Amino acid sequence: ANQASVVANTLIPINTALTLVMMRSEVVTPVGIPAEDIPRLVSMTVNRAVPLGTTLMPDMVKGYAA
Protein backbone atom coordinates (compact mmCIF):
# COMPACT_ATOMS: atom_id res chain seq x y z
CA ALA A 1 0.00 0.00 0.00
CA ASN A 2 1.63 3.43 0.80
CA GLN A 3 5.19 2.13 1.00
CA ALA A 4 7.52 5.02 0.33
CA SER A 5 10.71 4.45 -1.64
CA VAL A 6 13.83 6.46 -2.21
CA VAL A 7 13.38 8.61 -5.39
CA ALA A 8 16.14 10.60 -7.15
CA ASN A 9 15.48 14.23 -6.22
CA THR A 10 17.94 15.31 -8.91
CA LEU A 11 20.00 13.36 -11.53
CA ILE A 12 22.52 11.22 -9.63
CA PRO A 13 25.69 10.99 -11.90
CA ILE A 14 27.41 7.70 -12.35
CA ASN A 15 30.02 6.82 -9.79
CA THR A 16 28.88 9.59 -7.46
CA ALA A 17 28.47 9.36 -3.75
CA LEU A 18 24.90 9.89 -2.53
CA THR A 19 24.03 13.05 -0.52
CA LEU A 20 20.80 14.05 1.39
CA VAL A 21 19.67 16.54 -1.25
CA MET A 22 19.83 13.80 -3.93
CA MET A 23 17.10 11.68 -2.25
CA ARG A 24 13.41 12.13 -1.34
CA SER A 25 10.71 9.61 -0.31
CA GLU A 26 7.72 8.98 -2.48
CA VAL A 27 4.93 6.34 -2.66
CA VAL A 28 5.68 4.87 -6.10
CA THR A 29 5.17 1.53 -7.92
CA PRO A 30 7.18 -0.72 -8.16
CA VAL A 31 8.64 -0.22 -4.69
CA GLY A 32 12.41 0.46 -4.60
CA ILE A 33 14.67 0.93 -1.55
CA PRO A 34 12.64 1.97 1.63
CA ALA A 35 12.80 5.68 2.54
CA GLU A 36 14.02 4.69 6.03
CA ASP A 37 17.23 3.67 4.36
CA ILE A 38 18.19 7.15 3.19
CA PRO A 39 20.90 7.76 6.01
CA ARG A 40 22.42 4.27 5.36
CA LEU A 41 22.71 5.27 1.66
CA VAL A 42 24.60 8.58 2.27
CA SER A 43 28.13 8.29 0.76
CA MET A 44 27.39 5.06 -1.09
CA THR A 45 27.87 5.27 -4.85
CA VAL A 46 25.49 4.40 -7.67
CA ASN A 47 26.67 2.26 -10.52
CA ARG A 48 24.78 3.98 -13.35
CA ALA A 49 23.44 7.52 -13.86
CA VAL A 50 20.04 7.78 -12.07
CA PRO A 51 17.81 10.29 -13.85
CA LEU A 52 15.52 12.75 -11.97
CA GLY A 53 12.44 11.02 -10.58
CA THR A 54 13.83 7.43 -10.76
CA THR A 55 13.18 5.01 -7.87
CA LEU A 56 16.47 3.83 -6.42
CA MET A 57 16.53 0.10 -6.71
CA PRO A 58 18.81 -2.17 -4.54
CA ASP A 59 20.87 -3.24 -7.60
CA MET A 60 21.87 0.40 -8.46
CA VAL A 61 23.83 1.13 -5.30
CA LYS A 62 27.31 -0.26 -5.03
CA GLY A 63 27.70 -2.04 -1.69
CA TYR A 64 23.98 -2.02 -0.75
CA ALA A 65 22.54 -4.92 1.09
CA ALA A 66 19.42 -4.53 3.36
N, CA, C and O atoms as a printed pandas DataFrame, in Angstrom:
     atom_number atom_name residue_name chain_id  residue_number  x_coord  y_coord  z_coord
0              1         N          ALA        A               1    0.819   -1.193    0.000
1              2        CA          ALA        A               1    0.000    0.000    0.000
2              3         C          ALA        A               1    0.866    1.260    0.000
3              4         O          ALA        A               1    1.642    1.382   -0.947
4              5         N          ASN        A               2    0.835    2.215    0.938
5              6        CA          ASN        A               2    1.633    3.431    0.799
6              7         C          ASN        A               2    3.067    3.255    1.326
7              8         O          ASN        A               2    3.484    3.909    2.283
8              9         N          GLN        A               3    3.801    2.353    0.670
9             10        CA          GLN        A               3    5.194    2.126    0.996
10            11         C          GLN        A               3    6.034    3.133    0.220
11            12         O          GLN        A               3    6.096    3.101   -1.009
12            13         N          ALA        A               4    6.681    4.029    0.969
13            14        CA          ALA        A               4    7.516    5.015    0.333
14            15         C          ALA        A               4    8.847    4.427   -0.057
15            16         O          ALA        A               4    9.375    3.568    0.649
16            17         N          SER        A               5    9.403    4.875   -1.171
17            18        CA          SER        A               5   10.709    4.447   -1.644
18            19         C          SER        A               5   11.575    5.667   -1.835
19            20         O          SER        A               5   11.084    6.790   -1.948
20            21         N          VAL        A               6   12.877    5.431   -1.870
21            22        CA          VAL        A               6   13.831    6.459   -2.210
22            23         C          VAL        A               6   13.637    6.813   -3.702
23            24         O          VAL        A               6   13.593    5.917   -4.545
24            25         N          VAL        A               7   13.521    8.103   -4.023
25            26        CA          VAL        A               7   13.379    8.612   -5.389
26            27         C          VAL        A               7   14.466    9.683   -5.561
27            28         O          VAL        A               7   14.742   10.470   -4.656
28            29         N          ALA        A               8   15.071    9.680   -6.757
29            30        CA          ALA        A               8   16.135   10.597   -7.145
30            31         C          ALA        A               8   15.551   11.989   -7.190
31            32         O          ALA        A               8   14.746   12.290   -8.072
32            33         N          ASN        A               9   15.935   12.844   -6.265
33            34        CA          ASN        A               9   15.476   14.228   -6.224
34            35         C          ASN        A               9   16.135   15.087   -7.279
35            36         O          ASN        A               9   15.679   16.201   -7.540
36            37         N          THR        A              10   17.194   14.596   -7.888
37            38        CA          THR        A              10   17.936   15.309   -8.907
38            39         C          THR        A              10   18.642   14.207   -9.717
39            40         O          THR        A              10   18.622   13.070   -9.246
40            41         N          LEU        A              11   19.260   14.428  -10.880
41            42        CA          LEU        A              11   20.002   13.357  -11.535
42            43         C          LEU        A              11   21.174   12.972  -10.636
43            44         O          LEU        A              11   21.861   13.857  -10.126
44            45         N          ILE        A              12   21.420   11.693  -10.427
45            46        CA          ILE        A              12   22.517   11.217   -9.634
46            47         C          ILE        A              12   23.520   10.727  -10.689
47            48         O          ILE        A              12   23.214    9.747  -11.367
48            49         N          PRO        A              13   24.708   11.351  -10.874
49            50        CA          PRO        A              13   25.688   10.994  -11.897
50            51         C          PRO        A              13   26.243    9.662  -11.517
51            52         O          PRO        A              13   26.231    9.266  -10.351
52            53         N          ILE        A              14   26.735    8.966  -12.526
53            54        CA          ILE        A              14   27.408    7.698  -12.354
54            55         C          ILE        A              14   28.584    7.868  -11.430
55            56         O          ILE        A              14   29.253    8.901  -11.431
56            57         N          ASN        A              15   28.832    6.829  -10.631
57            58        CA          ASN        A              15   30.021    6.822   -9.790
58            59         C          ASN        A              15   30.092    8.012   -8.819
59            60         O          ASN        A              15   31.177    8.499   -8.500
60            61         N          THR        A              16   28.931    8.465   -8.359
61            62        CA          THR        A              16   28.884    9.587   -7.456
62            63         C          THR        A              16   28.187    9.157   -6.178
63            64         O          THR        A              16   27.156    8.485   -6.159
64            65         N          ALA        A              17   28.834    9.600   -5.118
65            66        CA          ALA        A              17   28.473    9.362   -3.753
66            67         C          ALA        A              17   27.141   10.052   -3.444
67            68         O          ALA        A              17   26.947   11.201   -3.840
68            69         N          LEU        A              18   26.235    9.389   -2.758
69            70        CA          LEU        A              18   24.898    9.894   -2.529
70            71         C          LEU        A              18   24.878   10.907   -1.426
71            72         O          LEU        A              18   25.494   10.671   -0.386
72            73         N          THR        A              19   24.191   12.049   -1.591
73            74        CA          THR        A              19   24.033   13.047   -0.523
74            75         C          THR        A              19   22.539   13.245   -0.168
75            76         O          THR        A              19   21.691   12.797   -0.941
76            77         N          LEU        A              20   22.173   13.894    0.965
77            78        CA          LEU        A              20   20.795   14.047    1.387
78            79         C          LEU        A              20   19.920   14.842    0.450
79            80         O          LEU        A              20   18.733   14.533    0.342
80            81         N          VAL        A              21   20.430   15.845   -0.234
81            82        CA          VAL        A              21   19.669   16.542   -1.253
82            83         C          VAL        A              21   19.414   15.763   -2.552
83            84         O          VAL        A              21   18.601   16.202   -3.365
84            85         N          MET        A              22   20.082   14.628   -2.770
85            86        CA          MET        A              22   19.828   13.802   -3.931
86            87         C          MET        A              22   18.606   12.876   -3.746
87            88         O          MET        A              22   18.122   12.314   -4.728
88            89         N          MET        A              23   18.101   12.707   -2.524
89            90        CA          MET        A              23   17.101   11.683   -2.252
90            91         C          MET        A              23   15.831   12.159   -1.551
91            92         O          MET        A              23   15.927   12.862   -0.545
92            93         N          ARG        A              24   14.657   11.804   -2.040
93            94        CA          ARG        A              24   13.414   12.131   -1.339
94            95         C          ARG        A              24   12.658   10.834   -1.132
95            96         O          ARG        A              24   13.103    9.798   -1.625
96            97         N          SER        A              25   11.522   10.840   -0.417
97            98        CA          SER        A              25   10.715    9.614   -0.308
98            99         C          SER        A              25    9.457    9.862   -1.105
99           100         O          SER        A              25    8.950   10.983   -1.133
100          101         N          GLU        A              26    8.945    8.826   -1.756
101          102        CA          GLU        A              26    7.719    8.978   -2.478
102          103         C          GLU        A              26    6.955    7.676   -2.478
103          104         O          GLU        A              26    7.617    6.638   -2.447
104          105         N          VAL        A              27    5.631    7.610   -2.509
105          106        CA          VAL        A              27    4.933    6.341   -2.662
106          107         C          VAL        A              27    4.910    6.109   -4.158
107          108         O          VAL        A              27    4.261    6.869   -4.877
108          109         N          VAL        A              28    5.590    5.092   -4.653
109          110        CA          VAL        A              28    5.680    4.871   -6.102
110          111         C          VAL        A              28    5.488    3.391   -6.363
111          112         O          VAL        A              28    5.486    2.616   -5.406
112          113         N          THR        A              29    5.323    2.950   -7.613
113          114        CA          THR        A              29    5.165    1.526   -7.918
114          115         C          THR        A              29    6.034    1.233   -9.152
115          116         O          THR        A              29    5.914    2.003  -10.104
116          117         N          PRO        A              30    6.888    0.215   -9.241
117          118        CA          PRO        A              30    7.183   -0.719   -8.157
118          119         C          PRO        A              30    7.947   -0.052   -7.026
119          120         O          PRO        A              30    8.510    1.031   -7.189
120          121         N          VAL        A              31    7.955   -0.713   -5.881
121          122        CA          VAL        A              31    8.644   -0.217   -4.694
122          123         C          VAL        A              31   10.154   -0.445   -4.902
123          124         O          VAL        A              31   10.557   -1.475   -5.442
124          125         N          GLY        A              32   10.972    0.505   -4.476
125          126        CA          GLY        A              32   12.407    0.463   -4.602
126          127         C          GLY        A              32   12.934    0.444   -3.213
127          128         O          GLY        A              32   12.262   -0.112   -2.344
128          129         N          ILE        A              33   14.098    1.010   -2.914
129          130        CA          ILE        A              33   14.672    0.929   -1.552
130          131         C          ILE        A              33   13.785    1.688   -0.551
131          132         O          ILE        A              33   13.321    2.764   -0.927
132          133         N          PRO        A              34   13.504    1.245    0.675
133          134        CA          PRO        A              34   12.642    1.968    1.629
134          135         C          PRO        A              34   13.178    3.337    2.000
135          136         O          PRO        A              34   14.393    3.492    2.123
136          137         N          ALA        A              35   12.318    4.347    2.186
137          138        CA          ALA        A              35   12.799    5.681    2.545
138          139         C          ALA        A              35   13.566    5.686    3.858
139          140         O          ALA        A              35   14.433    6.539    4.047
140          141         N          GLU        A              36   13.278    4.764    4.772
141          142        CA          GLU        A              36   14.017    4.687    6.026
142          143         C          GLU        A              36   15.483    4.379    5.798
143          144         O          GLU        A              36   16.286    4.523    6.721
144          145         N          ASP        A              37   15.856    3.962    4.603
145          146        CA          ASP        A              37   17.232    3.669    4.356
146          147         C          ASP        A              37   18.017    4.829    3.825
147          148         O          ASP        A              37   19.194    4.662    3.505
148          149         N          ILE        A              38   17.418    6.029    3.708
149          150        CA          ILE        A              38   18.195    7.152    3.190
150          151         C          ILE        A              38   19.498    7.402    3.990
151          152         O          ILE        A              38   20.523    7.486    3.313
152          153         N          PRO        A              39   19.607    7.532    5.333
153          154        CA          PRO        A              39   20.903    7.757    6.009
154          155         C          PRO        A              39   21.954    6.652    5.832
155          156         O          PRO        A              39   23.151    6.940    5.855
156          157         N          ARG        A              40   21.528    5.394    5.656
157          158        CA          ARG        A              40   22.422    4.274    5.359
158          159         C          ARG        A              40   23.024    4.479    3.972
159          160         O          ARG        A              40   24.193    4.155    3.760
160          161         N          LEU        A              41   22.248    5.014    3.015
161          162        CA          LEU        A              41   22.706    5.268    1.663
162          163         C          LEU        A              41   23.634    6.447    1.469
163          164         O          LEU        A              41   24.295    6.497    0.432
164          165         N          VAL        A              42   23.740    7.401    2.383
165          166        CA          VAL        A              42   24.600    8.578    2.272
166          167         C          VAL        A              42   26.036    8.115    2.127
167          168         O          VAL        A              42   26.499    7.291    2.916
168          169         N          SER        A              43   26.755    8.628    1.133
169          170        CA          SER        A              43   28.132    8.294    0.763
170          171         C          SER        A              43   28.296    6.992    0.023
171          172         O          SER        A              43   29.426    6.651   -0.328
172          173         N          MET        A              44   27.229    6.230   -0.241
173          174        CA          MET        A              44   27.386    5.062   -1.094
174          175         C          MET        A              44   27.329    5.573   -2.521
175          176         O          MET        A              44   26.813    6.665   -2.756
176          177         N          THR        A              45   27.840    4.824   -3.472
177          178        CA          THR        A              45   27.870    5.269   -4.849
178          179         C          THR        A              45   26.868    4.504   -5.688
179          180         O          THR        A              45   26.574    3.348   -5.387
180          181         N          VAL        A              46   26.337    5.116   -6.730
181          182        CA          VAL        A              46   25.492    4.403   -7.667
182          183         C          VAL        A              46   26.364    3.870   -8.782
183          184         O          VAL        A              46   27.475    4.354   -8.999
184          185         N          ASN        A              47   25.862    2.873   -9.489
185          186        CA          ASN        A              47   26.667    2.263  -10.525
186          187         C          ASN        A              47   26.197    2.578  -11.932
187          188         O          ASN        A              47   26.635    1.941  -12.890
188          189         N          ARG        A              48   25.314    3.548  -12.066
189          190        CA          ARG        A              48   24.780    3.977  -13.347
190          191         C          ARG        A              48   24.213    5.367  -13.095
191          192         O          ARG        A              48   23.850    5.651  -11.954
192          193         N          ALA        A              49   24.111    6.257  -14.088
193          194        CA          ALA        A              49   23.439    7.524  -13.865
194          195         C          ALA        A              49   21.947    7.351  -13.498
195          196         O          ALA        A              49   21.252    6.629  -14.213
196          197         N          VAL        A              50   21.427    7.966  -12.438
197          198        CA          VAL        A              50   20.037    7.782  -12.074
198          199         C          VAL        A              50   19.342    9.082  -12.388
199          200         O          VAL        A              50   19.547   10.073  -11.688
200          201         N          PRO        A              51   18.525    9.106  -13.422
201          202        CA          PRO        A              51   17.809   10.294  -13.850
202          203         C          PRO        A              51   16.818   10.860  -12.832
203          204         O          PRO        A              51   16.367   10.121  -11.957
204          205         N          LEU        A              52   16.462   12.149  -12.916
205          206        CA          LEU        A              52   15.516   12.751  -11.974
206          207         C          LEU        A              52   14.177   12.008  -11.918
207          208         O          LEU        A              52   13.568   11.735  -12.952
208          209         N          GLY        A              53   13.732   11.687  -10.716
209          210        CA          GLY        A              53   12.441   11.024  -10.583
210          211         C          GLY        A              53   12.540    9.497  -10.651
211          212         O          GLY        A              53   11.499    8.847  -10.561
212          213         N          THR        A              54   13.706    8.886  -10.802
213          214        CA          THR        A              54   13.827    7.427  -10.757
214          215         C          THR        A              54   13.814    6.881   -9.339
215          216         O          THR        A              54   14.452    7.451   -8.453
216          217         N          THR        A              55   13.096    5.781   -9.110
217          218        CA          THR        A              55   13.185    5.013   -7.872
218          219         C          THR        A              55   14.529    4.268   -7.780
219          220         O          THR        A              55   14.919    3.532   -8.687
220          221         N          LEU        A              56   15.211    4.485   -6.662
221          222        CA          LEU        A              56   16.471    3.830   -6.422
222          223         C          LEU        A              56   16.141    2.382   -6.094
223          224         O          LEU        A              56   15.384    2.075   -5.174
224          225         N          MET        A              57   16.740    1.516   -6.884
225          226        CA          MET        A              57   16.532    0.104   -6.707
226          227         C          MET        A              57   17.767   -0.492   -6.026
227          228         O          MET        A              57   18.850    0.063   -6.209
228          229         N          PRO        A              58   17.684   -1.589   -5.249
229          230        CA          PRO        A              58   18.814   -2.173   -4.541
230          231         C          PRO        A              58   20.022   -2.408   -5.441
231          232         O          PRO        A              58   21.152   -2.136   -5.035
232          233         N          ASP        A              59   19.802   -2.912   -6.665
233          234        CA          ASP        A              59   20.871   -3.235   -7.600
234          235         C          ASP        A              59   21.633   -2.032   -8.161
235          236         O          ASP        A              59   22.640   -2.240   -8.837
236          237         N          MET        A              60   21.209   -0.777   -7.917
237          238        CA          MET        A              60   21.871    0.400   -8.461
238          239         C          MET        A              60   22.950    0.923   -7.522
239          240         O          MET        A              60   23.836    1.656   -7.962
240          241         N          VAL        A              61   22.898    0.567   -6.241
241          242        CA          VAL        A              61   23.828    1.134   -5.305
242          243         C          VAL        A              61   24.904    0.100   -5.025
243          244         O          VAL        A              61   24.637   -1.043   -4.655
244          245         N          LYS        A              62   26.131    0.556   -5.219
245          246        CA          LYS        A              62   27.312   -0.262   -5.029
246          247         C          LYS        A              62   27.537   -0.511   -3.564
247          248         O          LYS        A              62   27.782    0.443   -2.826
248          249         N          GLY        A              63   27.466   -1.746   -3.099
249          250        CA          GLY        A              63   27.700   -2.041   -1.687
250          251         C          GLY        A              63   26.429   -2.098   -0.836
251          252         O          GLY        A              63   26.528   -2.130    0.390
252          253         N          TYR        A              64   25.241   -2.110   -1.443
253          254        CA          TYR        A              64   23.978   -2.021   -0.746
254          255         C          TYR        A              64   23.479   -3.422   -0.492
255          256         O          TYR        A              64   23.331   -4.223   -1.415
256          257         N          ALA        A              65   23.225   -3.704    0.755
257          258        CA          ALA        A              65   22.545   -4.919    1.089
258          259         C          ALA        A              65   21.585   -4.412    2.178
259          260         O          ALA        A              65   21.969   -3.518    2.932
260          261         N          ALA        A              66   20.358   -4.939    2.297
261          262        CA          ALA        A              66   19.423   -4.530    3.356
262          263         C          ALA        A              66   19.532   -5.466    4.575
263          264         O          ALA        A              66   18.822   -5.277    5.563
